[PDB]
Design a protein around this ligand. Structure first.
Ligand SMILES: Cc1cc2nc3c(=O)[nH]c(=O)nc-3n(C[C@H](O)[C@H](O)[C@H](O)COP(=O)(O)OP(=O)(O)OC[C@H]3O[C@@H](n4cnc5c(N)ncnc54)[C@H](O)[C@@H]3O)c2cc1C
Ligand SMILES: NC(=O)c1ccc[n+]([C@@H]2O[C@H](COP(=O)([O-])OP(=O)(O)OC[C@H]3O[C@@H](n4cnc5c(N)ncnc54)[C@H](OP(=O)(O)O)[C@@H]3O)[C@@H](O)[C@H]2O)c1
Length: 524
């Protein structure tokens, strides 16, 4: 185990995409920097989430680093949407190339962080009893990094094999001949289930809220196409950085409501056949007008009923009541087709809720299911989850958990008043988008600022209370013009993610920096 140093200019928490780039860039800026990571190796979500079928919902050519021209040119994606093992190889490739592991302490969990106003330094403690003093602390601790604690009664009494998708075994699990249950029909459950169906004697899928999901239409990435792209990657990447989604995606000019029924079909069928999440932009108002939303939502509801041959199964799979695409659109590869199989059973817990786990399996209010294995695809804590497991204390020894008790309040999503020299990467108040575009922007902003602090001899950077309030207000106002607040997931009041688009978000941050970091108080 690599032991962390006693002092460093910057301490990073987390060794996924975000923390690795921060480590990379601070080295390039001539700053001392070190990374603390719980996991045994690099990767973050792509180290932990090793379940069969784990796959990205952003195209390979967009979900990737761009800071290295060498990496863009030497690496070769294989599919439209990269599988978890490929991406982890990608990340491992970059870590080897840039010798990043020499600045990471693995197997170690930051447990406390307290700011010393007298030394303008953070004292950072871990479960191994390390104590690290760093001028700045970067939290690259993720948004989907803490598996939600499934709190079913009787869970400990389950006789069989228990698995969670967010912490899958590092050796492949053979489900052949078994009765297997999957609890959760979000992205992880929609991804892992069709893999397990290929092996299990019987699969039971326990669904509570049904969610929208459209075909991935995954495919091999044509080498020639890729070799053409590599000749223009930097320009292609700048194009992505000038979109709302941080990805190439057609912006439909037509309102969903000003079109004939037959056109709406033909147009949506194009997207349904082409696959991917781009259908979200099919018409300009899908996320701004409920009637428009519904019109698009009914098209997809009918695609479900037309895929599932049992009308009773099909309609339990149809999402109703909540707007389409207000929750990040799931892509599915043969998930709906899966229920046409003899060995697959959809279990509607809204109809009959889970009363307890038993030695033998799962007991709903109406019957008991005997299972050899139980797979929990039950999601993660709120994006505040990883930070909230750390005892973070700022000015006046106030805890971060107390300050974010009624929602995570920040300035720009990067810092919060009363906690100086503390930055959050791809965290609350930041933009929802292609996380690699957003991570790169965030890491460059944060480390640029740290470089500015050192160049000018300043040692304390702190967001101004009033600007933080102003930002929460602004984030709330943008979202309110949207269907997003209609989905409770965006609160933990503080609407959690900026929905004004990556491009508008980058422009805001750039102008803050060009104006001497307006809204931060910088002192020595
Ligand atoms: C299966 C899956 C698919 C996804 N697909 C997409 C997609 O298609 N598009 C997209 O935009 N996003 C996607 N995401 C979101 C994903 O989180 C981001 O794309 C990106 O990987 C986040 O990188 P990160 O380094 O900021 O966070 P993470 O990858 O979560 O890294 C955080 C790291 O910090 C570590 N850590 C946390 N707390 C501590 C602590 N106290 N001490 C030490 N270490 C700590 C964790 O162990 C973890 O390794 C997906 C996520 C998952 C799980
Ligand atoms: N690229 C990809 O394909 C991919 C893969 C994984 C994750 N992601 C992203 O990362 C995030 C996490 O996705 P996720 O699927 O793992 O979690 P999730 O989206 O929050 O869904 C969790 C599922 O488990 C169910 N569940 C949770 N607790 C339950 C309980 N006590 N009883 C019954 N059912 C319960 C939920 O039902 P309810 O809906 O009723 O609560 C839900 O269906 C998502 O935002 C997703 O976009 C993307």
């Amino acid at each position: 185990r690599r032991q962390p140093p006693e002092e460093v200019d910057v301490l990073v928490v987390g060794a996924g995409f975000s923390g690795l780039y921060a480590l990379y860039r601070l080295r390039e800026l001539g700053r001392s920097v070190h990374v603390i990571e719980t996991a045994g190796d690099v990767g973050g979500v792509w180290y932990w989430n090793r379940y069969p079928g784990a796959r990205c919902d952003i195209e390979s050519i967009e979900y990737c680093y761009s800071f290295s021209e060498e990496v863009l040119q030497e690496w070769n994606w294989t599919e439209r949407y990269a599988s978890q093992p490929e991406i982890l190889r990608y990340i491992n490739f970059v870590a080897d190339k840039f010798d990043l592991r020499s600045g990471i302490t693995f197997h170690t969990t930051v447990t406390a962080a307290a700011f010393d106003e007298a030394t303008n330094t953070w004292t950072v403690d871990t479960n191994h009893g390390d104590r690290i003093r760093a001028r700045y602390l970067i939290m690259a601790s993720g948004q989907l990094s803490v598996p939600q604690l499934p709190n079913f009664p009787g869970l400990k009494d389950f006789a069989g094999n228990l698995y969670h998708t967010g912490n899958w075994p590092h050796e492949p699990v053979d489900f052949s001949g078994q009765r297997v249950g999957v609890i959760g029909t979000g992205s992880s459950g929609i991804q892992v289930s069709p893999q397990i169906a290929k092996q299990a004697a019987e699969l039971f899928v326990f669904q509570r809220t049904p969610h929208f999901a459209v075909p991935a239409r995954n495919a091999p990435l044509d080498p020639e196409f890729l070799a053409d792209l590599k000749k223009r990657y930097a320009e292609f990447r700048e194009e992505s950085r000038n979109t709302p989604g941080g990805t190439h995606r057609y912006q439909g000019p037509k309102s969903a409501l000003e079109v004939s029924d037959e056109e709406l079909v033909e147009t949506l069928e194009r997207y349904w056949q082409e696959g991917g999440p781009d259908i979200l932009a099919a018409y300009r108002d899908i996320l701004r007008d409920r009637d428009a939303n519904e019109r698009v939502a009914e098209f997809i509801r009918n695609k479900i009923r037309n895929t599932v041959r049992d009308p009773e199964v099909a309609e339990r799979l149809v999402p109703k009541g909540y707007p389409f695409g207000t929750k990040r659109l799931i892509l599915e590869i043969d998930y709906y087709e899966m229920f046409n199989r003899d060995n697959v059973h959809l279990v509607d817990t809204l109809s009959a809720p889970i009363e307890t786990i038993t030695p033998r399996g799962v007991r709903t209010s109406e019957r008991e299911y005997e299972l050899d294995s139980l797979v929990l695809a039950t999601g993660f804590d709120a994006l505040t989850g990883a930070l909230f497991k750390i005892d973070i204390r700022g000015v006046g020894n106030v805890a971060l958990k107390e300050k974010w008790a009624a929602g995570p309040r920040t300035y720009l999503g990067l810092s919060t008043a009363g906690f100086p020299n503390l930055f959050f990467i791809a965290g609350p108040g930041s933009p929802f988008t292609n996380m690699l575009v957003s991570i790169e922007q965030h890491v460059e902003w944060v480390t640029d600022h740290i470089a500015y602090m050192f160049k000018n001899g300043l040692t304390r950077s702190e967001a101004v209370l009033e600007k933080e309030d102003e930002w929460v207000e602004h984030v709330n106002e943008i979202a309110d013009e949207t269907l997003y607040p209609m989905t409770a997931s965006w609160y933990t009041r503080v609407f959690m993610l900026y929905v004004g688009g990556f491009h508008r978000y980058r422009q805001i941050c750039d102008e803050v920096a060009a104006k001497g970091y307006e809204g931060f108080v910088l002192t020595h």
